[PDB]
Amino acid sequence: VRPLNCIVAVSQNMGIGKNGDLPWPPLRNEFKYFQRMTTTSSVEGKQNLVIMGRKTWFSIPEKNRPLKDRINIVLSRELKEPPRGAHFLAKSLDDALRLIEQPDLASKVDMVWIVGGSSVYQEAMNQPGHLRLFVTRIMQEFESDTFFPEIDLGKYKLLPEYPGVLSEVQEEKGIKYKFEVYEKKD
Numbered sequence: 001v002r003p004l005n006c007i008v009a010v011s012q013n014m015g016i017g018k019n020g021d022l023p024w025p026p027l028r029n030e031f032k033y034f035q036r037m038t039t040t041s042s043v044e045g046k047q048n049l050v051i052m053g054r055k056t057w058f059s060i061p062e063k064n065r066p067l068k069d070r071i072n073i074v075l076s077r078e079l080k081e082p083p084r085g086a087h088f089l090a091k092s093l094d095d096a097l098r099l100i101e102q103p104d105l106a107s108k109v110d111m112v113w114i115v116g117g118s119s120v121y122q123e124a125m126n127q128p129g130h131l132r133l134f135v136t137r138i139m140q141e142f143e144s145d146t147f148f149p150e151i152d153l154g155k156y157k158l159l160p161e162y163p164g165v166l167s168e169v170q171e172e173k174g175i176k177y178k179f180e181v182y183e184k185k186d
């Protein structure tokens, strides 16, 4: 609940979005990794938490909202009530992070995951303190509207391994990809 974990999939040209959806066709195996990582808490009786922007929330198929077995927080400056299905609404990343640390939620929340979109990764990456980036490198170029912020290797250490994360190149529908974990301490 203290370290912030961002999870994203990025094309070779650092693309993450096109026209409000993903630049590539659905990678269901990639999705399963996102589901496993964001859902699997380290403690029985606690759930992980996902924070996402308003556009990303509404870009999730309604039949798949909220993201199951995670506490879902949506960021929005204009909505006044949480979207239907969402557990909480926050008007700022700071508000959301302050909320998560409340004692009311201590025996309820384990890991915190930022899950999109562009604008939220940007602001999460502006935070001081402990950040992880779970980055799926999609090993191909795709036409993109939006881009993941630069990953400064002076700031983020590329971990050689991470528990529960396989390092081999994967392939789905002719599209190769691999899982990486970066960490910025303090």
Ligand SMILES: NC(=O)C1=CN([C@@H]2O[C@H](COP(=O)(O)OP(=O)(O)OC[C@H]3O[C@@H](n4cnc5c(N)ncnc54)[C@H](OP(=O)(O)O)[C@@H]3O)[C@@H](O)[C@H]2O)C=CC1
Pocket: 007, 008, 009, 010, 015, 016, 017, 018, 019, 020, 021, 022, 052, 053, 054, 055, 056, 057, 059, 075, 076, 077, 078, 079, 090, 091, 092, 093, 115, 116, 117, 118, 119, 120, 123, 146
């Ligand atoms: N490649 C990947 O792994 C992923 C890609 N995506 C992609 O992300 C792209 C879109 O990103 P983006 O346009 O930034 O949309 P977002 O999903 O981040 O939604 C943006 C909205 O979130 C709210 N918001 C953002 N930051 C803050 C904050 N600091 N405090 C309070 N509210 C905030 C605002 O809502 P409001 O306007 O209501 O005030 C803002 O307009 C899409 O292409 C989508 O496909 C999404 C998830 C994962």
